Design a protein around this nucleic acid. Structure first.
Length: 41
DNA sequence: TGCCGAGGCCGCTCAATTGGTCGTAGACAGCTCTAGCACCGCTTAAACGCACGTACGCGCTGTCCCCCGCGTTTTAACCGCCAAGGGGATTACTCCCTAGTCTCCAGGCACGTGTCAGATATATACATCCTGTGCATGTACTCGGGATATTG
């Protein structure tokens, strides 16, 4: 929905393996305009 | 009474192990070496093991004779404990430096041969050093009496 309606923005996943979470934390260590997250994380 | 508050059972979601499947890369097993030099077989003249009273050396033996063992219990603090406090050993993160890879590149030297000598072995003659024996004292010991040190 972000990619179809607002290609003006850039979006970060934040779920899955601890490795992928740890890696993504480097990219938001603000062109990381929005992050998508789950309650359980 | 009331209310409710506190109370006790059951599907998500994530996070190690566990076991499974993929594909690919040297390293293992094996072949033929081949090649050669050790194992063998065959003699020989050779050393050294070995089955075997007797002199006799000492391993084992029958006695008595005593401390250190054997037994008791008081106590004495040794040793254990628990609980608290402080920090320092620990954890999790970010930056950082080099460990490690490969690659090129040389010559140092460990490798190898090529000759043949000063070395040490072996014999005979032998003298001498060294062992086994026999043989005095000199001390290091065991005891008794008193002085100094140290525990309670």
């Amino acid at each position: 929905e972000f990619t179809r309606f607002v290609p003006k923005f850039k979006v970060l996943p934040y779920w899955g393996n601890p490795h992928d979470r740890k890696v993504i934390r480097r990219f938001w260590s603000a062109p990381f305009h929005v992050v998508i997250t789950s309650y359980q994380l």
